[PDB]
Design a binder for this molecule. Structure first.
Ligand SMILES: Nc1nc2c(ncn2[C@@H]2O[C@H](COP(=O)(O)OP(=O)(O)CP(=O)(O)O)[C@@H](O)[C@H]2O)c(=O)[nH]1
Length: 169
C-alpha cells in the first residue's frame, strides 16, 4: 500500500473543496462545505495497486496559511484548479505553479491542470486555451465538474499516475 501526498491549489471559488469532498466523501454526512484548509484521506485502487491518498485542500492566495511552504515540500503532486467561467482564475495558474517551483526548486513537479465547472454551458476559457497552457508546462489537462462528478476521480487518478511516472524516471 503506497501513500501519495496530493495538494489542490487554485484561486478561491474555483471548486477545490467541491472536488476534494466529492472524491473523499463516504456520504455519511449529507452536506459538507468546508471553508478552512484541511487534509482528507481516501484509499483507492489504481491500476491494481491499493493507494492511500492524503489530499490537502488549500486556500487561495488570499487566505493566509503558515504551513503553506511546508505543505508544498511534503506534497508530491498538485492539482492546479481553475474555473472555465473565470478567466482570472485561469491566469492565476501561473502564480500557483511558480509558487510550487519556488519551494520545490524544480520544473519537473507532478501536476495536473484542472478546468472545473465544465457543466456550465457558458464558459470563458476555451479548451484549446487550457490544453495549450498544459502543453507549455508538460502536464495533463482534465475538465471536471464537482456537480456532475464528471472527470473528478480521473483528475486525482491522473495525478497519482503522474507521480508514479515521475518516481520511476
Ligand atoms: N456549477 C458548478 N459550481 C461548482 C462546481 N464546483 C464548485 N462549484 C461552486 O462554486 C462555489 C465555490 O466552491 P468551493 O468548493 O468552495 O471552491 P473553493 O473556493 O476553490 C474551495 P476552498 O476555498 O474551501 O478551498 C460554490 O458555490 C460551489 O457550489 C462545479 O463543478 N460546477
Amino acid at each position: 500500500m503506497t501513500e501519495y501526498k496530493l495538494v489542490v491549489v487554485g484561486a478561491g471559488g474555483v471548486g477545490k473543496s467541491a472536488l476534494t469532498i466529492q472524491l473523499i466523501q463516504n456520504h455519511f454526512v449529507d452536506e459538507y462545505d468546508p471553508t478552512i484548509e484541511d487534509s482528507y484521506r481516501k484509499q483507492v485502487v489504481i491500476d491494481g495497486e491499493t493507494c492511500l491518498l492524503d489530499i490537502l485542500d488549500t486556500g487561495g492566495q488570499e487566505e493566509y496559511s503558515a504551513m503553506r511552504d511546508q505543505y508544498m515540500r511534503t506534497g508530491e503532486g498538485f492539482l492546479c484548479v481553475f474555473a472555465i467561467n473565470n478567466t482570472k482564475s485561469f491566469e492565476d495558474i501561473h502564480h500557483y505553479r511558480e509558487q510550487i517551483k519556488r519551494v520545490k526548486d524544480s520544473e519537473d513537479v507532478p501536476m495536473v491542470l484542472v478546468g472545473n465547472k465544465c457543466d456550465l454551458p457558458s464558459r470563458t476559457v476555451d479548451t484549446k486555451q487550457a490544453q495549450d497552457l498544459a502543453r507549455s508546462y508538460g502536464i495533463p489537462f482534465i475538465e471536471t465538474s464537482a456537480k456532475t462528478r464528471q472527470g473528478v476521480d480521473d483528475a486525482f487518478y491522473t495525478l497519482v499516475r503522474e507521480i508514479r511516472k515521475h518516481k520511476e524516471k
